[PDB]
Design an enzyme around this catalytic site. Structure first.
Site, short mmCIF file in Angstrom:
data_model
loop_
_atom_site.label_atom_id
_atom_site.label_comp_id
_atom_site.label_asym_id
_atom_site.label_seq_id
_atom_site.Cartn_x
_atom_site.Cartn_y
_atom_site.Cartn_z
N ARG A 97 0.87 -1.30 -0.19
CA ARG A 97 0.14 -0.09 -0.03
C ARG A 97 0.80 1.19 0.09
O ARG A 97 1.01 1.79 -1.19
CB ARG A 97 -0.96 0.06 0.98
CG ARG A 97 -1.85 -1.23 1.32
CD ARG A 97 -2.78 -1.10 2.41
NE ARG A 97 -3.39 -2.80 2.55
CZ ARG A 97 -4.22 -3.04 3.83
NH1 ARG A 97 -4.60 -1.88 4.39
NH2 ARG A 97 -4.94 -3.92 3.68
N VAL A 98 1.42 1.62 1.10
CA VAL A 98 2.17 2.82 1.20
C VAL A 98 3.74 2.25 1.08
O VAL A 98 4.26 2.29 2.03
CB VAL A 98 2.35 3.70 2.67
CG1 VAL A 98 0.98 4.70 2.40
CG2 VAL A 98 1.90 2.63 3.98
#
Lengths: 155, 310, 263, 164, 131, 164, 310
Positions: free
Chosen positions: D109-110
């Protein structure tokens, strides 16, 4: 609770929701009902062999059900799919319009004598009624009525 | 999804907004805060600030996570009653309220209920949830994201949450793993508003048609699962082909999804959505390939997408 | 989901996985034999039509469907029935002949009164020129002096690929003599009555030899898909069963402990 | 960098403690705070802003699934703690593909805006063509019996697979 | 040059093979077709097939029934229902059939049966023209 | 020769007492020593050497299963306790095969050395032939184009099944 | 297989073995006792015995069944540290050790964990299985017979056991009925040390080559039965005939079974096996018949047997 109760009986009559679901009343399970007196030395060897034969063909159909449901009907030979149409007629002749269920069935209640019942399934197993449709057998009394209902269901 | 929804509704909103982070990731606040400062909805220099933030993330002990939802909704309660406006309440995650309860219920001296939950689950949620509502003095639009544990929609937690809702939008893993986003189950999701007397009979008849064509496709899915498509009838072969096109036309590129799916985000006007799915249902596009409907905004972009494939 | 239900479907998919598995094998032997018997039969068909393609034949102013009986071969019967009903409305008098029972049932109700003859037992025993001759005899014994016909069948290409093909049969003996036939000399009127009759038996046999090769191949295929779609469904439900078995034991035990820890 | 190998074994350890303590057995006999056990720990992996010193703790926790069951209680929890996953299918490992990373399931995700640009210039059209290959190429056996524009995607895939 | 194609339903012999001349037992006697032969279609008759190869030595075959074709370009094709090489036919059983065939001829009066028995006579009487 | 008919019902009768004497409950509410209840009962059956008179006691426990589940706690106990099992099935029963002994699952460890040298002479052959039959049993009707080998192995099996 | 392992460790490495029977059936105890004397490992006269037998019978309470696996381990631990041997420890069966410990925890009154097992399951396994490793003085290598319940590998019992298992040995009916002894399934038995880094570069490629050539044989089995033997290509005909000679060379006569078989027993050294199989893969014995490699020691005894008479 009901599982412990089994060991306390002489004859057990088991009912299914799946059998009742298909409109088959009484919803007695032919493969789940066991009697102590289902001995040919008591009921007669004709009575016994007919009943054993009645169950076998319904048992055989149950094994075919899932195979034919995905892989069509044509893949059964002329002696296999002949049992399928028989079993469904044996299944439906087991249905009986009760005299108490007049309010539900919509039919006059029927009472079938012992020898009229054994002759009934004996003939269907023999295949003497292979020409008649299944619906002729659904919800009738004696076997003559299954012929009668076919004639009316004709025209 | 709840971040996309903010970007869609919360930003272009007249009244105020309250966000309540309940038991999710701490960086999920540091993301929202810096993104919101950037968009102007939070102003540090002056006080034109539009959103109020309350947090009790998954670093906080059960007690704090148990009451932090109340903190947020109380901030929202005021903007509804004492000022009488259009409040937008956002909660992520609402499950952590009952989970935190689960964590203390044991020690409080209760006897465990189903799945070892607090016996008070029924009412613990009720008194708290019934506050989050629209009154005759003001209105709260409440978007609450609901964590499902072990994908078990029958777990006492997500299953009790349904009863408190007006619109349920159910996200499904199977759908997600089919690369459909938003991963919304189009047959498990329901709205109390789906009534021709509100959305209009034209809206209703396209929603009921899309659902029928999808329910029929799903009921054929056990036969195709063994046999393969080749074995269907010529009537059914069409319904399958449309339902699949519909499936992908229900997928959509979000604006918050941009920064990892490479596709430009899209918002679709309601007349374009209804007219869109009508045409697929009407058989106008039985010639376009399925993937032409995959991840596009309006229906006019499916036509464009099909032309690309030369 | 219940232990009664789960195992019932496991009992029955372990059937299909196997039943389908052998139906792949049954078709796999019938393919390998039909692939060898096609190698010469193709050359035979090549030499058969090498006259109607070298000299153009038209008609100035009969549909034959070639498949089999046994289904589950994917889309063999359904691809030819699509191209038959395509020409059933596009054309002029149309009289149909269907070899294989699965043409008498798939495209019948629609053209029930447009039947000339029906043929059964096709695809049970690998076809012969003897089978094609019985198809040739019955055609010429019927009081239907056809102007022109076309034979539709499945031409073999590979294990997975095949294509529905038409071949026009200029088997009218009145159409056997055209302006392109004026190139040819040393012919009888009633020697074409012999050649046209035989070149008909060739192309029927050729289409039949292509069909039973294209049919058994895609049944081998469809069943290798279906048995390994069941192989996947077994492996999926089996560990769904374990989930539900372990959870039923655990859940039946919490139900006791919860009741014991209240007294 | 901290690596927790693994939390599933620390879970049973804590479940032993909770059950010996006589705390209410819940889902899979796990106590109500097995989510919390892994929540408070993995939060502690963080990237500090410059004012705080610009130091970062990066976490790689491990989870052992039973027969691929990601929907299970403990795994779903950790999916809902972590900022992304890497799946390792037994069906790729017992096949020879190592590392056995399921590309169609693993996402970070990040972590995108923390990749080298030089990598983005090659990995961007790799992820694009790898999904184009994973666009149902299970059919496999036919050699040169398929189309024209789709046969090269089968060609590209297996090479872009072998390279990994 | 001319491309020659000769085969049966079961077995294949020639496929566009370079051959100079072929002799064929047609209805109209036995026709001989050379490299640039005229466009003439003629059906087959039980008898001998002579295929003149490219290297001096000729191969010969026996046919039951079928068809031969010679076209507007130099290309020939010949086909038969059952064609076998001289190698695999017994000279013994051929006379047993012929004598049995000439027995049913005088024992059948039906106009349909007469033709059916005489064709078998013709086929068996051609089985000694080679063996 | 002794026949405990049945041990599932003694297991119930024991369980009652423990639960009411307030001993800890386990799987299906059975106490810890219910395996120990049956293990000491069934080991008591043995064959003594000519040193101890050469006498023997032979045990035949009966276990009732529900829905064929042999993995229920009590059945799991007795299966391991004993030297072998005979599995009877509802299907086999109504299908006709009576006694409804499942040839597949049913097993005896003592087996070969227990039957007379006369029986040995025809048993192992039947064990092998019914084994090869059950593998093909599903295609007993759907096998027109099967080889004459498996077609013999099907005809061999159906006829032996009638004999049993 | 157990007895031959006892013989061959005592032979090749000069290390003793210990059999710990957890939940031993008394009939099977007696039967296993005389089987060991009759074959040679237990010597009722002198001191040449190679095994120590510990019996936790079934008719003994859960305490005895739960601790006997230790009583066996401690007898084995003496020969590791005091005499510095490479010891061998048999546990049969490990599941009845887990069920033994579940009963104890159920008896003491501990709240049961998942699937009815004990809460201490992880440690109950750890505190014993971690005594079985290689020390500075010696090493204990343990062969454990496993019962899996409901053939469920995810069941906590086998799941907790597998975390400690470095290799498997599958004894199968199918392979035993073909005549291959020991009845080991070559593809079904797997090992952690099947790594070029541990055993070596050669060992790895030869093992994998044998593994692949048997899978190919299975992969061509349907093509063999239903196509026509003589229509496989040169490379498909060859690998079939080579593969059959591989599974025969797996066969090995056993020393322990000289009293039954009457034929001489074999101990095939490590490198003898590796090169032996490598040559068959390389085709160095494409000319030799199948029956030549059956029930032989090294590759030498196979070529010599190939001569026989003609």
């Amino acid at each position: 609770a009901p599982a412990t109760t089994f060991a306390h009986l002489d004859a057990t009559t088991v009912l299914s929701r799946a059998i009742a679901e298909l409109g088959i009343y009484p919803a007695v399970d032919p493969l789940d009902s066991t009697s102590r007196i289902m001995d040919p030395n008591i009921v007669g060897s004709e009575h016994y062999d007919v009943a054993r034969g009645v169950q076998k063909i319904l048992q055989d159909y149950k094994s075919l059900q899932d195979i034919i449901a995905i892989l069509g009907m044509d893949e059964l030979s002329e002696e296999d799919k002949l049992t399928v149409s028989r079993a469904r007629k044996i299944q439906r002749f087991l249905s009986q319009p009760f005299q108490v269920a007049e309010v539900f069935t919509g039919h006059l209640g029927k009472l079938v004598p012992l020898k009229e019942t054994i002759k009934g399934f004996q003939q269907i197993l023999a295949g003497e009624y292979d020409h008649l449709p299944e619906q002729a057998f659904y919800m009738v009394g004696p076997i003559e009525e299954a012929v009668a209902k076919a004639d009316k269901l004709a025209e | 999804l709840i971040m996309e929804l903010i970007n869609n509704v919360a930003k272009a909103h007249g009244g105020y907004s309250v966000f309540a982070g309940v038991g999710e990731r701490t960086r999920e606040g540091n993301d929202l805060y810096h993104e919101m400062i950037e968009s102007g909805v939070i102003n540090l220099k002056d006080a034109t600030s539009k959103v109020a933030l309350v947090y009790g993330q998954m670093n906080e002990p059960p007690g704090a996570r148990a009451r932090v939802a109340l903190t947020g909704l109380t901030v929202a309660e005021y903007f509804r009653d004492q000022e009488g406006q259009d409040v937008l309440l956002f909660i992520d995650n609402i499950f952590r309220f009952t989970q935190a309860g689960s964590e203390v219920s044991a020690l409080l001296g209760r006897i465990p209920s189903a799945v070892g939950y607090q016996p008070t689950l029924a009412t613990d949620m009720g008194t708290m949830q019934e506050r989050i509502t629209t009154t005759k003095k003001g209105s709260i639009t409440s978007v609450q994201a609901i964590y499902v544990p072990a994908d078990d929609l029958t777990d006492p937690a997500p299953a009790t949450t349904f009863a408190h809702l007006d619109a349920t939008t159910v996200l499904s893993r199977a759908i997600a793993e089919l690369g459909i986003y938003p991963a919304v189950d189009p047959l498990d999701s329901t709205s109390r508003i789906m009534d021709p007397n509100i959305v209009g009979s034209e809206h209703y008849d396209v929603a009921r048609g899309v659902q029928k064509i999808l329910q029929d496709y799903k009921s054929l899915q056990d036969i195709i699962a063994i046999l393969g498509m080749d074995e269907l009838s010529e009537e059914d072969k069409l319904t399958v082909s449309r339902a699949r096109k519909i499936q992908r036309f229900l997928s959509q590129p979000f604006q918050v999804a941009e920064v990892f799916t490479g596709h430009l985000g899209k918002l679709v006007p309601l007349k374009e959505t209804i007219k869109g799915f009508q045409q697929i249902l009407a058989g106008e596009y039985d010639h376009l390939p399925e993937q032409a409907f995959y991840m596009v905004g309006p229906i006019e972009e499916a036509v464009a997408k099909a032309d690309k494939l030369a | 989901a219940t232990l009664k239900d789960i195992t019932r479907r496991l009992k029955s998919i372990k059937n299909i996985q196997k039943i389908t598995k052998s139906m792949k094998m049954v078709a796999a032997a019938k393919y390998a034999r039909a692939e060898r018997e096609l190698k010469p039969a193709r050359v035979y068909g090549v030499g058969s039509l090498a006259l109607y393609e070298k000299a153009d034949i038209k008609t100035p102013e009969l549909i034959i469907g070639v498949s089999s009986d046994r289904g589950l071969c994917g889309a063999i019967h359904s691809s030819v029935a699509k191209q038959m009903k395509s020409e059933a409305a596009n054309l002029k008098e149309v009289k149909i002949i269907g070899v294989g029972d699965k043409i008498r049932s798939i495209l019948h109700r629609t053209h029930s009164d447009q039947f000339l003859v029906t043929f059964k037992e096709v695809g049970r025993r690998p076809p012969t020129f003897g089978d094609a001759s019985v198809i040739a005899l019955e055609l010429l014994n019927s009081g239907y002096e056809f102007d022109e016909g076309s034979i539709i069948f499945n031409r073999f290409r590979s294990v997975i690929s095949y294509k529905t093909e038409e071949k026009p049969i200029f088997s009218l003996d009145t159409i056997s003599s055209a302006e392109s036939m004026s190139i040819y000399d040393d012919i009888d009127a009633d020697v074409l009555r012999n050649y046209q009759e035989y070149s008909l038996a060739n192309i029927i046999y050729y289409s039949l030899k292509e069909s039973t090769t294209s049919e058994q191949s895609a049944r081998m295929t469809a069943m290798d898909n279906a048995s390994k779609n069941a192989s996947e469904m077994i492996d999926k439900l089996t560990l769904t069963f374990n989930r539900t078995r372990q959870a039923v034991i655990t859940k039946e035990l919490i139900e006791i402990i919860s009741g014991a820890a209240a007294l | 960098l901290i690596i927790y190998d693994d939390l599933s074994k620390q879970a049973v350890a804590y479940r032993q403690m909770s059950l010996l303590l006589r705390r209410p057995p819940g889902r899979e006999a796990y106590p109500g705070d097995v989510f919390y056990l892994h929540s408070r720990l993995l939060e502690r992996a963080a990237k500090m802003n410059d004012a705080f010193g610009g130091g970062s703790l990066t976490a790689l926790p491990v989870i052992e699934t039973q027969a691929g069951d990601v929907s299970a209680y403990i795994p779903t929890n950790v999916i809902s703690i972590t900022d992304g996953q890497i799946f390792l299918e037994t069906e790729l490992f017992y096949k020879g593909i190592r590392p056995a990373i399921n590309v169609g399931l693993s996402v970070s995700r990040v972590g995108s805006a923390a990749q080298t640009r030089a990598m983005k210039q090659v990995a961007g059209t790799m992820k694009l063509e790898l999904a184009q290959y994973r666009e149902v190429a299970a059919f496999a056996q036919f050699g040169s019996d398929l189309d024209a524009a789709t046969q090269q995607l089968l060609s590209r895939g297996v090479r872009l697979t072998e390279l990994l | 040059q001319m491309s020659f194609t000769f085969a049966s339903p079961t077995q294949v012999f020639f496929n566009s093979a370079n051959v100079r001349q072929v002799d064929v037992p047609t209805q109209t006697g036995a026709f001989g077709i050379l490299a640039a032969h005229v466009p003439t279609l003629q059906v087959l008759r039980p008898g001998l097939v002579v295929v003149h190869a490219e290297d001096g030595t000729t191969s010969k075959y026996f046919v039951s029934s079928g068809s031969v074709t010679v076209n507007a370009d130099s290309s020939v094709q010949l086909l038969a229902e059952e064609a076998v090489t001289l190698d695999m036919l017994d000279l013994g059983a051929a006379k047993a059939n012929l004598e049995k065939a000439q027995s049913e001829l005088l024992g059948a009066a039906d106009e349909a049966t007469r033709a059916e028995i005489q064709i078998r006579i013709e086929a068996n009487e051609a089985l000694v023209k080679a063996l």
